[PDB]
Amino acid sequence: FPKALGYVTGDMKELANQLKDKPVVLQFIDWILRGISQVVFVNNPVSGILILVGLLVQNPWWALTGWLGTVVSTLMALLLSQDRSLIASGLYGYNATLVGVLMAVFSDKGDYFWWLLLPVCAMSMTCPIFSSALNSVLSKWDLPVFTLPFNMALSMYLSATGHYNPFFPAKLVIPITTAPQISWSDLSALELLKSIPVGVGQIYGCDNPWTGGIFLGAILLSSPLMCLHAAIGSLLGIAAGLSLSAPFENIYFGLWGFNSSLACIAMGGMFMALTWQTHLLALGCALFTAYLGVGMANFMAEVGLPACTWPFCLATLLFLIMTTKNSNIYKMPLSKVTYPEENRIFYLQAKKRMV
Amino acid sequence: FPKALGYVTGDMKELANQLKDKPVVLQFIDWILRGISQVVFVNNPVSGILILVGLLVQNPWWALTGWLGTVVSTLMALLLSQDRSLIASGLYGYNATLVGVLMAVFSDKGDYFWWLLLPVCAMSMTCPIFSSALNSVLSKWDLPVFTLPFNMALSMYLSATGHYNPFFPAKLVIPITTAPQISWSDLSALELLKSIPVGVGQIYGCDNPWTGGIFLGAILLSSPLMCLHAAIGSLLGIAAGLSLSAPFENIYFGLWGFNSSLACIAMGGMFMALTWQTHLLALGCALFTAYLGVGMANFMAEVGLPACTWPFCLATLLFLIMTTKNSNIYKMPLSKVTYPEENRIFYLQAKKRMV
Amino acid sequence: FPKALGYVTGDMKELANQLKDKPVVLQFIDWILRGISQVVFVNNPVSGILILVGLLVQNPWWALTGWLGTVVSTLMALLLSQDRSLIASGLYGYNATLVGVLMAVFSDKGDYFWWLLLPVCAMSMTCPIFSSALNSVLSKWDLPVFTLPFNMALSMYLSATGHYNPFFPAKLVIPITTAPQISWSDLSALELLKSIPVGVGQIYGCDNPWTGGIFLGAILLSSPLMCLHAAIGSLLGIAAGLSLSAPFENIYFGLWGFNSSLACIAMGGMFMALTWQTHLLALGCALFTAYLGVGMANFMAEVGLPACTWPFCLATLLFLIMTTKNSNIYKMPLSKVTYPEENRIFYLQAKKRMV
Ligand SMILES: CC(C)CCC[C@@H](C)[C@H]1CC[C@H]2[C@@H]3CC=C4C[C@@H](OC(=O)CCC(=O)O)CC[C@]4(C)[C@H]3CC[C@]12C
Ligand SMILES: CC(C)CCC[C@@H](C)[C@H]1CC[C@H]2[C@@H]3CC=C4C[C@@H](OC(=O)CCC(=O)O)CC[C@]4(C)[C@H]3CC[C@]12C
Ligand SMILES: CC(C)CCC[C@@H](C)[C@H]1CC[C@H]2[C@@H]3CC=C4C[C@@H](OC(=O)CCC(=O)O)CC[C@]4(C)[C@H]3CC[C@]12C
Ligand SMILES: CCc1ccc(S(=O)(=O)c2nnn3c2nc(NCc2cccs2)c2sccc23)cc1
Ligand SMILES: CCc1ccc(S(=O)(=O)c2nnn3c2nc(NCc2cccs2)c2sccc23)cc1
Ligand SMILES: CCc1ccc(S(=O)(=O)c2nnn3c2nc(NCc2cccs2)c2sccc23)cc1
Ligand SMILES: CCc1ccc(S(=O)(=O)c2nnn3c2nc(NCc2cccs2)c2sccc23)cc1
Ligand SMILES: CCc1ccc(S(=O)(=O)c2nnn3c2nc(NCc2cccs2)c2sccc23)cc1
Ligand SMILES: CCc1ccc(S(=O)(=O)c2nnn3c2nc(NCc2cccs2)c2sccc23)cc1
């Protein structure tokens, strides 16, 4: 049993090589699963299978649209002659996994609106281009792309269609125009505890708590530190939402924890080596990202758009561009970013080489 | 006759030298005409004369304001000691040609509102500065400026004034707040065919189909491939507008084809060498730019602004920053970008040098 | 007396060294005062004391919140191991001075709303991070950060809270939806003359004319050329507001002169060496910044936000990125930027070295 566990954990490098030998259809399936799991920074195909099972538990229509987005984007990246090493780590399929899931989430035509498969494909062909263009700009300065391709594609689509499109109408994004009445005596501790997996689930747009638990299980299969930081970031988003007197139904829905969950995953050991200083910095980034999330939600509601994960991308890029003279606050080279355990081993060896 | 034709086609280099010898007033007239024609990437003074005739066919007031914008911007670039080689190719006068035409298009005071000549001049003095600043930023990474100076100047002006300015009121940009009723049985094939020149005309803000035909004739005088790609991009914008169930009156007005016309001109042989792969990529950029055009139109209608050619600039910069490992998808060096025929000859010679 | 005057003018380098010898609490007080004064580009602790006296003349609650912002941001920059040379010149405390003053200005809970000290601190801990991140990006290309950290922090906060927050409600930013009735016969020359110090005061959000006079006195203590350009930029903003038929009550309140005052300070001898050409360019930047100020005010009123000093930052970055071939339009190296008198001496010596 421990052999199989070590085989299915981390990034699954042994299977990656074994499939490099295998036919290209199996490799394509592998790239699709890694692209599904890469939404939570996880480059693991079994984590991708678990995340797909969680999406099917939420809504099979969303799983279908998201898997089709992943497939169309990986095929489009193959057609555009992109780096095969980036395609095989699923880095050309996760933005379109998100595009496909959240075009169905933000759709006003209900489940199994088959015509929606036409814009899905369309926007899933724009995600490699986005992913390529940004990966140029941001790799000049050794910065990750994050989910900026998904965010640009979805903002473009939801602006192009809107609520009043005769073909593909979107959900109505309403700005707030009256103060909410919060009854602090009706606050549930159980619902606040349940909001921790629901924010991890809302990373994919899924309000199911079982879906969020399955996503946390997938992240834990890849790296336990990633799971810890996902849970902690969702909790810190809950805390920020309570600090701004947000409606409890928005915290219970997990809308306050998914951006900060992603930001705590990214900062806590992933793109910054894991020390206690970078752990505290990841907590600060999670709180900052929750507050920027409500800021961008309120601001983009005015133009009829959802904030999505714009807050995570902007806040995490801000915290990665930030420089300190602290040697224990170390930004990982993008070429050596695998998962927090290996990242920490690499950082410790480099810190020994520094002394 | 063939000698004169070869003399008036392309970029007219022979006249450029002959005028380099001539007095500076004739050279200034040449730079003004090249700045007029440079709105459609054409560095030809006779094309500029034809485009000016088309503008006079549309509206002589718009021709006056646009020509005055060109003059003021070229004089301002001379005063700011800008590169004379950029001034003499009209690259300091086309953004202000657009500023001057579309300050009168988007004006709520009617034709021959003489006071409008005061903000025109003002904004036409901002277009060299814009053009200079951006040309710094974007030439670090060998990227064209496009009509970003015009877009920033016009967004700034139409925000500063707005619909309720007592002096210079602008047109009211209304967001959509109800679903349009489209009667697909009333769709005209003749109006859809006529919308192809009207999008090329709307490149300058002109809804006349004769003006669009004259603009296509000017582009054809410069380079037939540019004319082909202008027409094809306007057609692809028509197609995208039909695919999103747009009101037919917006497709007939050419609002769906001018951004994609510009994007197909830029990508189809101009800033990317012309192969069949880059032709298909230019078709994809034209479609993407039509969809981003309706997206940005809907989004900027919320802040009371028109999208203008923000979609063309953003989408074409995105497609130029994109990298592939395809050798036949070749991005032209900005120093060697003349017009698609010479660009293709240069690319073929460089590809022979590569082997 | 002249010895003391020479001791308290400029940047006060002698005191900076003498305090480098002194205990760290006195040095921290010095850094706080320099961070207060650095809002008007002044690196002088006695100017900071005078600006603090002006803030107390306006509103002691705003002085308290702004001083606490400065303190929290300087301590946070110390904790984040930022450059001590930047911390000691007050370059990590002025954006939070602004954050603290204008969180109380834009607050809907009145004076001495003690709970406001909690978000103040919070946003004052975000200003070093902002300041650090941007100072990375913008120092690659030798550009000043300006008040972009303050603007990002305040936009984020005022979006996160808004007018309808149950805890920290903000002021209601209303868009214009009807044409203002201006009675040009009721225009006061005395109020227009008084609007010159009120725009300098509104640099900090203060509508008191005595506060603006005290701020001009502080700037004059540092550098008389800075005071001259502050007054001239506020006047040019008055002129632009009259040219766009703005409501007189907005010009009298100083909302038209503070962005252009900052832009004339920055361009007139500060970040560009002071020649007569750069003086005229600073006048042009002041006018451009007034017009961009009303543009961004009208545009950001649509999303419920104030423009603040976004216009100053964007317009001054645009005018600094602009390149000319004029040798007498010289951009100062950021490492040699002290105050216009020393900047001009440095430029004259470098121009002798150029010949
Ligand atoms: C909630 C929002 C609005 C603001 C977010 C602020 C955070 C980004 C701050 C708050 C607490 C800060 C932390 C407080 C304490 C430390 C320990 C500090 O460690 C040291 O300086 C000790 C000596 C050494 O490590 O060598 C390094 C910075 C760090 C992690 C800080 C990183 C930045 C944090 C997370
Ligand atoms: C409509 C919107 C929402 C999406 C726009 C997608 C386009 C950018 C795509 C769709 C079709 C694509 C084209 C489909 C086929 C090809 C041929 C392909 O050629 C090869 O790979 C063959 C071998 C070789 O050229 O060496 C190069 C990419 C290209 C031009 C593609 C470029 C990108 C295009 C235009
Ligand atoms: C009001 C808004 C909408 C537009 C703002 C335009 C300004 C940026 C322009 C208008 C006047 C211009 C100035 C007009 C005259 C001159 C003198 C000129 O000096 C020379 O060329 C003389 C020879 C030499 O200096 O060697 C240098 C540019 C400058 C300062 C210009 C700088 C740019 C200015 C300030
Ligand atoms: C064009 C293809 C491309 C996509 C993303 C990146 S990248 O720069 O973003 C990035 N480089 N390494 N890397 C990245 N992205 C990850 N996860 C995806 C997500 C980001 C935000 C939310 S999920 C993970 S996981 C292990 C390593 C990495 C670079 C190139
Ligand atoms: C900080 C509070 C907050 C943040 C973001 C959004 S929001 O504007 O993003 C958004 N508004 N409605 N809404 C949104 N987000 C969703 N899922 C999370 C996402 C995952 C990836 C992209 S969205 C879902 S699921 C059903 C409705 C919605 C709204 C509120
Ligand atoms: C500051 C002056 C300046 C303006 C534009 C550019 S630039 O970088 O934009 C560009 N460099 N070469 N070049 C460009 N622009 C063209 N056409 C103008 C239009 C662009 C978008 C719509 S029209 C054409 S036509 C033949 C060659 C070119 C660079 C510098
Ligand atoms: C994709 C559909 C669409 C795109 C852009 C615009 S739009 O927001 O640009 C605009 N809204 N009204 N309007 C606009 N565009 C015009 N001409 C095109 C231009 C040339 C260069 C800059 S604008 C004219 S002409 C008379 C009215 C208008 C509106 C709709
Ligand atoms: C991260 C800390 C940091 C803050 C600002 C700058 S910086 O790049 O902005 C700048 N570099 N030098 N310098 C600057 N800023 C000044 N004034 C502050 C204001 C700017 C706009 C309005 S007040 C003055 S005054 C004398 C020299 C300078 C660089 C680094
Ligand atoms: C060109 C005209 C104009 C410019 C900016 C703003 S505005 O949107 O900035 C703003 N709207 N209300 N308001 C604002 N600005 C203030 N002070 C100036 C500042 C200093 C630093 C940041 S704000 C104050 S003081 C009390 C109310 C306000 C409004 C109008």
Numbering used by the authors:
A (entry chain A), B (entry chain B), C (entry chain C): 31 to 385
Q: What did the study's authors say about this model?
A:
While the initial excretion occurs through diffusion across the membrane, the subsequent reabsorption is mediated by urea transporters UT-A (HsUT-A; SLC14A2) and UT-B (HsUT-B; SLC14A1) which are differentially expressed in specific renal tubule compartments. The overall structures of HsUT-A and HsUT-B are similar to each other and to BtUT-B and DvUT, showing the trimeric arrangement with 10 TM helices and two pore (P) helices per subunit. In both structures, each subunit hosts a channel-like pore for urea transport and the channels are in the open state with approximately 2 to 3 Å in diameter at constriction formed by V69, T177, L292, and F342.
UTBinh-14 is a highly selective inhibitor for UT-B, with over a thousand-fold selectivity over UT-A. Owing to such properties, it has been used as a chemical probe to study physiological roles of UT-B and is an attractive lead molecule for a drug discovery program. Hypothesizing that this could be due to either the combination of low solubility and low affinity of UTBinh-14 or its low stability, we changed our structure determination technique to cryo-EM. This resulted in a refined ESP map with 2.6 Å nominal resolution, showing little conformational change and revealing UTBinh-14 blocking the channel on the extracellular side. UTBinh-14 fits well into this extracellular pocket, with its 2-thienyl group directly blocking the pore entry. The inhibitor forms hydrophilic interactions with the side chain of Q232 and the backbone carbonyl of A337 of HsUT-B, and its 4-ethylbenzene group sits in a hydrophobic pocket formed by W286, F288, G323, and A327. An interesting feature of the binding mode of UTBinh-14 is its 2-thienyl group at the channel pore entry. This group is in close proximity to C338 with its sulfur atom facing toward the residue, and this has forced the side chain of C338 to rotate away (with respect to the apo state) from the pore entry due to steric clash. Therefore, it is possible that the inhibitor could form a covalent bond with UT-B at C338 if the 2-thienyl group was replaced with a thiol group. Our cryo-EM map of UTBinh-14–bound HsUT-B shows a small molecule feature on the intracellular side of the channel pore. Real-space refinement with Phenix estimates its occupancy at 0.38, and the incomplete occupancy by UTBinh-14 suggests low binding affinity at this site compared to the extracellular one.
